[PDB]
Amino acid sequence: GKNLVYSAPTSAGKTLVAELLILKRVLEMRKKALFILPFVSVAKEKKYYLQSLFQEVGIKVDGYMGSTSPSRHFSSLDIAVCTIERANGLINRLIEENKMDLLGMVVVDELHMLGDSHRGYLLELLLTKICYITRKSASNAVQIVGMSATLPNLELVASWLNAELYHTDFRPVPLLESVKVDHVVSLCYETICDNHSVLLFCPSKKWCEKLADIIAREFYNLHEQKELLEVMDQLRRLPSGLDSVLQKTVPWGVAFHHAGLTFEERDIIEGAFRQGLIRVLAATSTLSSGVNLPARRVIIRTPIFGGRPLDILTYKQMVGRAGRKGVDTVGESILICKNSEKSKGIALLQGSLKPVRSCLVTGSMIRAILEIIVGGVASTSQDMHTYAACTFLAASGAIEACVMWLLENEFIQSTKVYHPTHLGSATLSSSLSPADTLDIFADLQRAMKGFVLENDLHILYLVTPMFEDWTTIDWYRFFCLWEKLPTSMKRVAELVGVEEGFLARCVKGKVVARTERQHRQMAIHKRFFTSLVLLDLISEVPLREINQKYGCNRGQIQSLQQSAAVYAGMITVFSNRLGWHNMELLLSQFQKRLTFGIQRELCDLVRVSLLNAQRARVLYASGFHTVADLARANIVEVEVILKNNMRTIWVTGRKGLTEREAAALIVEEARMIL
Amino acid sequence: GKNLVYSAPTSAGKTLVAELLILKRVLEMRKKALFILPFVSVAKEKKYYLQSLFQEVGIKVDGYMGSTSPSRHFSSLDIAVCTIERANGLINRLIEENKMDLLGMVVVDELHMLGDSHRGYLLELLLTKICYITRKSASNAVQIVGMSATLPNLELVASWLNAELYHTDFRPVPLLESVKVDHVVSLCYETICDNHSVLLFCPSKKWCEKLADIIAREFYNLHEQKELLEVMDQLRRLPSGLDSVLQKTVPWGVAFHHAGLTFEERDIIEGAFRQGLIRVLAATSTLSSGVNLPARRVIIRTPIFGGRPLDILTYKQMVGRAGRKGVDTVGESILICKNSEKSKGIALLQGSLKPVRSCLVTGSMIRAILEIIVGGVASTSQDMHTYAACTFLAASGAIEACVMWLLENEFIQSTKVYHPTHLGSATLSSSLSPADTLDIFADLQRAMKGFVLENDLHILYLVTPMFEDWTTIDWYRFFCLWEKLPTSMKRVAELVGVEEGFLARCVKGKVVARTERQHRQMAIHKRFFTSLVLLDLISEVPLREINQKYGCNRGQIQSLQQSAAVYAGMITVFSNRLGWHNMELLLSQFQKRLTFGIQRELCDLVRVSLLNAQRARVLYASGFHTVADLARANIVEVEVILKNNMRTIWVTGRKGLTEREAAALIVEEARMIL
Numbered sequence A, B: 001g002k003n004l005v006y007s008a009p010t011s012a013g014k015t016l017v018a019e020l021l022i023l024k025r026v027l028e029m030r031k032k033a034l035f036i037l038p039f040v041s042v043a044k045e046k047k048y049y050l051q052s053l054f055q056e057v058g059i060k061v062d063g064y065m066g067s068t069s070p071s072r073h074f075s076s077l078d079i080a081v082c083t084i085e086r087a088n089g090l091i092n093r094l095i096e097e098n099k100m101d102l103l104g105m106v107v108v109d110e111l112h113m114l115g116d117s118h119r120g121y122l123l124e125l126l127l128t129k130i131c132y133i134t135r136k137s138a139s140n141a142v143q144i145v146g147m148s149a150t151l152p153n154l155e156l157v158a159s160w161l162n163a164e165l166y167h168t169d170f171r172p173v174p175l176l177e178s179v180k181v182d183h184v185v186s187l188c189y190e191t192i193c194d195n196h197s198v199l200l201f202c203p204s205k206k207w208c209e210k211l212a213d214i215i216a217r218e219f220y221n222l223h224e225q226k227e228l229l230e231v232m233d234q235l236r237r238l239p240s241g242l243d244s245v246l247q248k249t250v251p252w253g254v255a256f257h258h259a260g261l262t263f264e265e266r267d268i269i270e271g272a273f274r275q276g277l278i279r280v281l282a283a284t285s286t287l288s289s290g291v292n293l294p295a296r297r298v299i300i301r302t303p304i305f306g307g308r309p310l311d312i313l314t315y316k317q318m319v320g321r322a323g324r325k326g327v328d329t330v331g332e333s334i335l336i337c338k339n340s341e342k343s344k345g346i347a348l349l350q351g352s353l354k355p356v357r358s359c360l361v362t363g364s365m366i367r368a369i370l371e372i373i374v375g376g377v378a379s380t381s382q383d384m385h386t387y388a389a390c391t392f393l394a395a396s397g398a399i400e401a402c403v404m405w406l407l408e409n410e411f412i413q414s415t416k417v418y419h420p421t422h423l424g425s426a427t428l429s430s431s432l433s434p435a436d437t438l439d440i441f442a443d444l445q446r447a448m449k450g451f452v453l454e455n456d457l458h459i460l461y462l463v464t465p466m467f468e469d470w471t472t473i474d475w476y477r478f479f480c481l482w483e484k485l486p487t488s489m490k491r492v493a494e495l496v497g498v499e500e501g502f503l504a505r506c507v508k509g510k511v512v513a514r515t516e517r518q519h520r521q522m523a524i525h526k527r528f529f530t531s532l533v534l535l536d537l538i539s540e541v542p543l544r545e546i547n548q549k550y551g552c553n554r555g556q557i558q559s560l561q562q563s564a565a566v567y568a569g570m571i572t573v574f575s576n577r578l579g580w581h582n583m584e585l586l587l588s589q590f591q592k593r594l595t596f597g598i599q600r601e602l603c604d605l606v607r608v609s610l611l612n613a614q615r616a617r618v619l620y621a622s623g624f625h626t627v628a629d630l631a632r633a634n635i636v637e638v639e640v641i642l643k644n645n646m647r648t649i650w651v652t653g654r655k656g657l658t659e660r661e662a663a664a665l666i667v668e669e670a671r672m673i674l
């Protein structure tokens, strides 16, 4: 357990060493092992992979990723495939419960995210606690493992972690590069004739959908079917249905992939391409760091990605998906350029990824100081300086500025020893940023004086996150909705801060510039708009109806779903720890409702993993109002209800699943829950 | 199953026929059997009796009395020993669920309450529903059995119910009434020396206590010990403790019994007198219709009870407690009189009880019409008139006046069929009086607009009943508390309607006369005072502290406990049916908290019947924060916690229980719950 850090190109079985190491450590020490992943999709996929590979050894595998969480305690778990933020929260609660010895390993995947990134600092602080706790209390207690592409400073990261080093550039499908004599039609025809796939990358969504249509149009003009029809049917019965352009583009082995689609549509398309049913896939920058989806030939439309050259870090992972290890001999990555873009293309072709930063007055240091002090591992100034040396910024004097910032905002109390009073303790358990916890405290306390219980809108407004611009708001449609709103919903609007004057300004006048810090009241109206969207969401109305009514597309609505559910859970824990029992009670149901977008009645029924929002309504309409009820039922009954040998449904991490034996697992899983 | 009605004097084994009939009917038809009792204490005692007598035959016995309820569905039950008000709700839910045939019999005890009483009309409607449903839908459908003293119109009741008749005046201990009018100490000494008890009845609580005190003083001047010391210790360890006067009075074979004491203290005194440990017991009019507590010699302080002649029914039920069937040969009921009271005493000696009335524009007929229409058993005028004939008022034209009152208040909708819209459906399920349901609807709807979640006070105010004057309010102390209140509690006070002007009027000026109907705002301040008492109650503060802070004694506080818990449950069901999910969620926890007067944390721990509020705190302080946790524990551990052969604890319906085996049963019952 001397830790470890290694790097290797993707599509080279780099995770295999990690799987062997985790298997050995869990089997030997009988302690936990966190598999930290950057994204929720890759976390889901890895959780399914580890479940399949370790089910036959009595090893529980259930991670904390997105808004979801295991239906069993952390004690029973053996491997937790969590995301960075949720792994940080897990470690915080372990420290607070003084059960840190329960862990025996922490694997981290795609470690290059530690650098310039809006989540990397969470990984940095997450790893900084492990080394500190190990060195204060013993270096064989917790093994750390890492992965990445060719990092220029891999040795530096290993030195920070006190771990070994392994760096290599190997891949069974070598990539070639050579310029050889709009020259795209012939390329596509010759690449499709040889029975190989193509993965094209586009900078934007609209043009990504546009060109996919015309590629299929050329394939149609110049001219397995059963499996493509199967994918058609699987796409047809979805809460959002089948797209108008996708329905005509798919028949010709052409598809597109972007955040605009739903998670289910993305999963369907990824599965179709991986199986080889889809030959040409126009993806976007989102897929670059997405699930493992190798392709024979990668193509890049243009280095310009959002008014600037393509990120070099993104290009490496883009090219990594050029070559299938096991069926392919060689892989290619074509980067078309222009006269002005020739310089940018040659610049991007050469040169590896940039060095890793630390991103540590900054809110990250405030979070770190709060974590260590509330955790009870750094209470006095003498030791808090050692934490600074433990960081990756150090190994590569702002503590006092943050420590006073916390005392200024009453997060902690000085005594010389430091302690949290109530808000620091509640801020750490909620895994909320201490910067926003003051605003959250004010908004909750204000709510508990004049709360509105007629509808869920006042509860939704308080669990509505606005830390990112999840969508562009059309203020004319928002004004129309405001006009059509009921009075009950307008009372909460007045309570929160919405004013008809501001909406009148925005409906006709240009979007008011928020030049001044006092103009956070622009955020109030965006928050109210988002909360109305969330209300229509948990009301179980179809995504298309929410799209027409508000303008946000289904992919944005799903991202809002996940963010709102995560925020609702965080706020519920915040209220629980603060001693606000009524607020906690009102908030508790909402995390699951937001995760699944369901009504109160379906909440007890979506406990079965194999039950979507639609598949929970059909069973509820039939009469299965409870998982226990759904267990007591013949399989054929559920089969006929689902219908009212061919695979038509879709579930995350599925297999040869049809309407027949899908009903078999629904009842079987319900029995296990009981 | 041709029904049955019979009467016989108490103290003559008169309930045995009912036990045989219920056993036969449940064993044969395998259908339920409600055992309706007037009071909650007698309902509890009868439930324990039937549990003991029918445990060995696989017959479940758990009734619905007071705020309590069985921890298992009504389907699993076989005998429900309910109180009159809750039996009506049971029948209403059976009718609304169209499962009326599940019932096999309905026994009713002490039917004289059918007449002039604030609960008899519920009995009348309850039996009218049975007769109506039986006659509309038929030999062995639902048997009805009644009990009473010598009713002048027993045959009339039998004719109404279509049942047989049996009336007899026989008792094993023939009572000898002989009025008589120095020799006081001689009488006391000669009655006590005979080794027989005395049951004195006194109207005034304070004078009853002083009379018991001076009897104990005479015994002390003129002057088993181990068992009496055991009763001392049992009284000592109570949430309210031991009274100063009771301490000096109990060890001379003298005790007192009045509503001022707690239910537990009343139980201790009743058990001590029944066992013979207590020789003289000064009770009040409450015990007259209370648990079966026979004595050898009954005495009455004076016919005058509350500034009026004593009710003949009360005297008739009082005399029944003079003579023990099995150990006594003869019994006496002496009635001291004066010169002016000689005529009143002579009149009271002769003449049986007054006839049974009906007490049916009246709110009772509104409730009846609502029950039948919402139940779906009388939807059109043609049949609602038959319900009038079904009643006891008829058998011994206000329907239209009531029906319009319901349409006037939107309780039902006309179509010529009738139906309920939403408020009628929610009014019958909640078992609330339709008169007060409009005020409740207004108060709930107003509350949800501006609800205060900072504390429980706003939730308590909405589950505070004020249909009776549970105590006299001291407005000076109320003003002191008001000026000492926190601002959070004052915001809800302003929201509900409390005004400093009215409290200023009441603190010095005489209680304002509520001559006008518009002065229900006097009820707002009484409701707020009661809700503050209830908040101090559910805060788990000792009864003595609530007494000094508010002036209401512990017996009044316990009556308020029960009434508030019952009302909270009714309001929770009302909100549930109305579709107010947030209000229902906020209200749900409060029913149990009010029943037991405990905090949220103890609510999962008082599920074990053998766990008082104090016995739930001691275990919670130890670490047993859940019934499942309390199951996983050794008996000696809980024994030492309880301590920190002698029967010192008390529980409803106890046996030779001590600190040792009480801990054994606590864990055993917890296992059964799981």
Ligand SMILES: COc1cnc(Cl)cc1-c1cnccc1C(=O)Nc1nnc([C@H]2C[C@@H]2c2ccc(C#N)cc2)s1
Pocket: A064, A066, A067, A068, A069, A074, A075, A085, A086, A087, A088, A089, A090, A093, A094, A097, A099, A102, A429, A430, A431, A565, A566, A567, A568, A569, A570, A573, A591
């Ligand atoms: C409390 O914040 C959340 C609540 N809801 C959701 Cl949906 C998401 C979050 C969240 C949001 N942003 C960042 C992080 C989190 C987060 O950390 N969430 C967690 N979910 N479970 C956790 C383990 C707490 C439990 C535990 C750990 C160890 C042991 C032991 N021995 C026992 C219990 S942490």
Ligand SMILES: COc1cnc(Cl)cc1-c1cnccc1C(=O)Nc1nnc([C@H]2C[C@@H]2c2ccc(C#N)cc2)s1
Pocket: B064, B066, B067, B068, B069, B074, B075, B085, B086, B087, B088, B089, B090, B093, B094, B097, B099, B102, B429, B430, B431, B565, B566, B567, B568, B569, B570, B573, B591
């Ligand atoms: C709903 O009003 C209450 C709620 N809380 C409490 Cl503490 C007391 C009351 C109450 C207050 N004042 C008068 C009457 C009541 C009352 O009616 N209480 C009830 N308690 N249990 C009931 C039956 C509900 C259960 C049932 C379920 C299925 C079937 C069948 N098949 C039959 C019955 S009704």
